[model samples]
Every structure is written in structure tokens, then in C-alpha cells.
Target: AQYEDGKQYTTLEKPVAGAPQVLEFFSFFCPHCYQFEEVLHISDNVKKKLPEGVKMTKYHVNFMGGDLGKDLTQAWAVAMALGVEDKVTVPLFEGVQKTQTIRSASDIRDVFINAGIKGEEYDAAWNSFVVKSLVAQQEKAAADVQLRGVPAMFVNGKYQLNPQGMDTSNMDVFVQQYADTVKYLSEK
Candidate 1:
């Protein structure tokens, strides 16, 4: 394997305590992150390649859209709370990154409403302690990473993969290699 520290990844000074997991730091406002998930489906592809019991989680960064960044993060939390992440992630991404229609939490609420979640249901989850705590966790996780960019991936919470080090010449080849690295690091 060509997984070298500093080249393919850097060891976190303070490694997060988790294993059999890949944590992705991204922002809905980031074009590359959008491509990573929506277009290239890197996360989805990687999930398929992961061994049984391994998991992938996404942490939406709070540094991208100003105050709106926080709102989008909350929106994502709410989506998770409602178990509608799969239904809403792409729509939210399209609304915010592609169409420029989403500007605040209310716009996000509308996205959920359009996805068949009742307005009142969305409201309750949006205000519930669970969603609040989820948002807080996401914010804290983003800060903990001392993140410098979007679409960053950390495996076992110890190794942060370097996108520049991957084979990007072809999307298929790149996704395969990326998943291979993630699987390798998950075992470490």
C-alpha cells in the first residue's frame, strides 16, 4: 500500500477515539464536497467497499456559509433526526449549491416539507434536544479537527486522507483507491 504519513495522510496530533469508522468533514456550501457526495458518490462507493461493521459518518462544517453555515448544519442535524437524510441531502445540496434557493433555516425547513415531512414534525425535531445535541456535536467535531478544508476524510479518527495523494486521473480508479486507503486505515 502507498499509504504514507504526510503523503497519503497525516496522523492527527490528537486522534479522535473511534475505530471501524470513517468521519468525513464537509460543508454543503462547498462545490467540491458537493461533488464528492452527490456527483462522484465517493462516500457511497466507499461504504460499499467497507468491511462489515465499519461505518461512515458525515460532519457538516460550520465555517463555510457564515451564519448560514450553522443553519445548514442544524438542517442536516434535523434531517438526521427525522431519518430523512437520504431523502433530503441531495435536495438540500441542490437548493443551496446549485439553485441558490436556500438562504436560511426556514428555507431548509421548506426543503424538508417538500420531502413529505410534515411542517409541524419538522418543527418539533428542529427544536428537540436530540437535534440540538446533534448540531452541537457536529460543531464541536468540526472545531476538533482544526480543519483547513472541506471534503476531508479521517479513518479510525486517526488518519486524515490527502485527496491530492489519490489517483484522480479517472473517477472509478480514484474512488477505488480512496476506498482502499480508507479500508486499510480502518484496520489500523
Candidate 2:
């Protein structure tokens, strides 16, 4: 089958390592992204469906245009550093979008704390030199992509797959199509 379908996607650029790299620009505060997660099941969906060798990395964007996103960036960076992303990612979104629980950095930290992350682990991950640098690096990367909205995705780096107009009601087809695009980009 041809690797392109104009109605569903558009081509842009190569990926991070010449492999099929899927970069998602998302935020915990974005309702659209929360829906994206609920429907797309981003973490498990991508991880489980992605073919071998394809790499998917999410870039947390401050779509809020405020300190909330900055704090989340810090929290997300730390969570990734501490290997608690899977535990905290969905909860963070739910807390803000569903339960309205998280209101500060401590609230964010508490999410991790309840997820079996030790206090020292959280401290080290939060303060780790690597996590600190990644915060800056991630900010620049988000800017470099010229992100304008949440739930935007890039394949192989430049080829962005904007799911704006698609039918969220049928994520099964949408996700399969996304996986197909990613797989096609991978072989190139």
C-alpha cells in the first residue's frame, strides 16, 4: 500500500535518529490532550502498538502559557528521570482534568509519593543535574517545533500528524492509522 493519505496526514521531516520517532507535544492541563489520552491511550497504545525500533517520546508543552505548564515540565522531567512516568502521567492528567486535585508543585510531588516513589527518590530525581538540564533542553525542543497546540504529533521529527479534524469517536481506526504512518516512516 502507498505510505501516504492526504486526508489523514502530512509529511514534513526526518526523525531523531533516522528511525521512526514519534514526538507528541502534550500537557496535563489540556482537556483535548486528556481526551487524546482517554481515547488514544497514548502511553499503552503507542508502546504496545509501535513496531520494534520505533521510538516515541512525549514533549510536555505549556499550552497553558503560564507557570502551571512550567511546573508540570519540572514534574514531568522528574517523573521521567525517576522512571515513574507511567505511574504519574495518567494520574497527573486525571488530577487536573478529572478530580481537580493537583494545585501546586507539592500536589504534583504527592502524586508520585502515592505511587510508591520514595521521598529520597523524588528528591534526587527532582534535583538531579540531568533532569535540570533536560528541562531547558525540552523547552528549547518544544519551541523548535513551533508548537501551536496540544496533542500535536511529529513523526521522524519533522513530519507532523495533526489529528485535529479526525473523528475522536473512533480512536481505534485513528490509532491504527497513526501506527501505520509511524511504521512507514520507520522504514524510510
Candidate 3:
């Protein structure tokens, strides 16, 4: 839902091979993403009940506010834009949600450094042409996916995990049950 192709793609173009990839396309500025964090974490716990290769990678999709966000648009494009997603994303998410103030470009750069991304590396990444390309992709996805809301989710592309208008309380159960749908579809 959140990570739609025309709507909001980052530099991440592929899925995790062999690993059971669960891409959580979300935004730090999103209330739903905030709530969904609980379910995502619960899903992680559920993974512990299973085997390996259950890798959860949270991608950014800035439906709530990218341009208006006090910082840069909080899309995965921003990470892709900076080219330090592997290093900065987790901390950036935490920082956005946990901190008192919203993140500025300066604050984001600090977050990058804290997450092991050097300033120069971050700068180079930000300045690359790929960053602009990814941003364009994200913009397209955002509009085409009709991302009028935050925290939409998708599984392997076809199955939408969350559609933004769905009931709230059913989320956790839906997520776990989704694993079965995905398993069946993949096996078939």
C-alpha cells in the first residue's frame, strides 16, 4: 500500500532474495505508521516463532507530508536521495518519532552520522542523480497509488496489506493472516 510503484518508490527496486521480505512502506510523520509500528513489531515477534529469512525492511513513503515536512520530504527517496538508507533509516525513524522537534535537514544529517553514515558520504549520496530519479519515482507512485493517506502496505506487489481505509483494530490479525495468503500465493 505505502510502497506502490508509481506512487512512492525509493532506490530500493528489488525484494530480499531468499529472505521472506516484508517491506513496510511508511512515514515517520504518519499517525497510522505510528500505530502500525506495534503490529510490525508484533509481526517481528511472530517471526521469532518461525524460522529465519523473515527480514523486515521499513521503507519510507511520504504521503502525510514530504514537501511540507519540516525536514526534507520524508520519503524513502530521501534516504535513497542521501544514498545512506542502510545506515540512516532506522535511526531516522526512531529520531522522528521519539524526538521533541521534527527533523530538519541539519538534524537528518546528524542522524546520518549517528547511524554510521559520514557527512561526506551522506553529501555524495544526496547529491547523486539517482536521488532525483528516485524522488521522481516516489512522486509518481504517490499519485498513481492514490496515496491520499499514510502507511499503506503491499505484499509482493499484488496483495495490498493495508488500504488506508480498512478497519483499525483488525490490523494485527490481518497482518498475520496475510502471511498465509502470501505463502499460498507464492507456493502456487
- What TM-score fits each model? 0.94, 0.85, 0.61
TM-score of 1: 0.94
The lDDT of each candidate is 0.84, 0.74, 0.52
For model 3, the superposed segments whose C-alpha errors exceed 4 Å read 1-24, 42-59, 66-75, 81-86, 155-158, 162-174, 184-188
Show pairs that collide, candidate 1: none
In angstroms, give how far residue 15 of model 2 lies from its true place. Answer: 8.8
Q: Over 4 Å off in model 1, which ranges?
A: 18-20
lDDT of 3 at 112: 68
Ranking by lDDT: 1, 2, 3
lDDT of 1 by residue, 1-188 (tens): 46788887789999877432688888889999888988789889889888889877887878898998888888889877777889998998999889999987888889999999999999999889999899988877777777878989888867888879776879888888888888887777
Q: What are the C-alpha RMSDs, in order, of all predicted structures? A: 1.5, 2.7, 7.9
Q: Best by TM-score, which number?
A: 1
| Residue 120 accuracy (lDDT) in model 2 | 88
- 1-188 in candidate 2: lDDT tens per residue? 45454545666543244422777778888987887786667655666767777767876876583887788998888877777777888789988889999888888888898889998888888888899887876677677666677777777765766455465567787777666665665566
Q: Please write out the lDDT profile of model 3 over residues 1-188, one tens digit for every residue.
A: 53343432222244323322443456667765665564354335434443344444444565455553524453356576555565654565566776634446777777767777677877776676776676665555544445566565444444345333233476666555545443433332
Backbone clash total, candidate 2: 4
Stronger candidate by lDDT (2 vs 3): 2
